[PDB]
């Protein structure tokens, strides 16, 4: 019922190998729907979901202009950042940006986000109030002072509470057959002996959307958090996600173990056992 829109920007410098590469991807929930890549033969915003293809050429043109300008701004930022950390021109560095809005079932703004990382570390973030900044270190305090003098937050806020929510609402309606559909996990438990006296039980969740899921094993109804091998939720490539959780059990005690699955697509949690 809740939804989000996010843009993710990455600029990577590469001294001796040209100017920094800029790439942006846009998501609604767990669905990517646009991309832009400054290394493309002819850089332009491109659709990556079916329900955004209907936007007119003025949409693609406008957004392409925006990304090209942003790429140039990120080049400036990367130069500034090297100075703020007393770094030489010889090393490669990364600037990441992520921003967007969360809305509830009624379409109303729940929370806005606008934040940055430099070489993988948090750098500066717009606070929840959308009026003030949190700087990670004295370099980022320089950015914060600049942005305070420029009243930079006011324009971020206007976008997050306005355009962001309005275009998210539009995308949700245009993509509603997919974006507002939860696909529940298809589940099953497998069993493989590892020795005469132990076996692996693996609980599988397949074909689910969105990616958020809880998969747990219990023994005699007690959570087995420490003893459970849990793989990171992974994309299948068909919009859906996969996950599994495994435990090693003494031979013959298999029926003491239950796998529990929670997902938005499930009315009630699933309890599963081997066979």
């Amino acid at each position: 019922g809740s939804h989000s829109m996010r843009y993710f920007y990455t600029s990577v410098s590469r001294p001796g190998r040209g100017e920094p590469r800029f790439i942006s991807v846009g998501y609604v929930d767990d669905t990517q729907f646009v991309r832009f890549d400054s290394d493309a033969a002819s850089p332009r915003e491109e659709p990556r979901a079916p329900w955004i293809e209907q936007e007119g050429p003025e949409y693609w043109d406008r957004n392409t202009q925006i990304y090209k300008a942003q790429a140039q701004t990120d080049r400036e930022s990367l130069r500034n950042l090297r100075g703020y950390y007393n770094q030489s021109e010889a090393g490669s560095h990364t600037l990441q940006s992520m921003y967007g809005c969360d809305v509830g079932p009624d379409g109303r703004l729940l929370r806005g986000h606008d934040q940055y990382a430099y070489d993988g570390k948090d750098y500066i973030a717009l606070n929840e109030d959308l009026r003030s900044w949190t700087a990670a270190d004295t370099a980022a305090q320089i950015t914060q002072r600049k942005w305070e003098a420029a009243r930079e937050a006011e324009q971020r806020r206007a976008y997050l509470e306005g355009e962001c929510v309005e275009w998210l609402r539009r995308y949700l309606e245009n993509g509603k057959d997919k974006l507002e559909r939860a696909d529940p996990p298809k589940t099953h438990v497998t069993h493989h002996p590892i020795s005469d006296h132990e076996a692996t039980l693996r609980c599988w969740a397949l074909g689910f959307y969105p990616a958020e899921i809880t998969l747990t094993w219990q023994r005699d109804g007690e959570d087995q958090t420490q003893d459970t091998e849990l793989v990171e939720t992974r994309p299948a490539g068909d919009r859906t996600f996969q996950k599994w959780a495994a435990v090693v059990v003494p031979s013959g005690e298999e029926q003491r173990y239950t796998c529990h699955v929670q997902h938005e697509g499930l009315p009630k949690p699933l309890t599963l056992r081997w066979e």
Binding site: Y7, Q65, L95, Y116
Partner: peptide, 9 residues
């Protein structure tokens, strides 16, 4: 759609 006129860091 993305935001524009964001300032440099």
């Amino acid at each position: 759609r993305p935001m524009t006129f964001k300032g440099a860091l």
